[PDB]
């Protein structure tokens, strides 16, 4: 009966990812970053996610992860901005950078 196993959208409960899918990018699953509007984000990297909607075409501008292009990842249900999808890199080719405090962690 684990209580930490899955991540849901904090705003609506949409199923998004699992603890098992945490990815230590550059040796840490957590990355503390800011965007050009100076917003600070505690980003958890996941190899896999579901229930998102990826919007727009990938951009390399201001990428926090060298060699990766990002798209905005919204909650596919409620439209909450949950993070970004990263692609175009190597090892891994793709992953998700999700904003920790926008997810709720709990049992399956």
């Amino acid at each position: 009966a684990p209580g930490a196993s899955i991540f849901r959208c904090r705003q609506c409960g949409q199923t998004i990812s699992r603890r098992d899918w945490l990815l230590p990018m550059g040796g840490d699953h957590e990355h503390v970053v800011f965007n050009p509007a100076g917003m600070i984000f505690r980003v958890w990297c996941f190899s896999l996610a579901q229930g998102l909607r990826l919007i727009g075409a990938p951009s390399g501008e201001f990428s926090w992860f060298k060699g990766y292009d990002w798209t905005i990842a919204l909650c596919g249900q409620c439209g909450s901005h949950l993070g970004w999808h990263y692609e175009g890199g190597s090892q891994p080719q793709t992953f998700f950078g999700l904003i920790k405090d926008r997810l709720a962690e709990g049992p399956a």
Binding site: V33, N35, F62, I72, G97
Partner: peptide
Amino acid sequence: QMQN
């Protein structure tokens, strides 16, 4: 807003 939502830029990475």
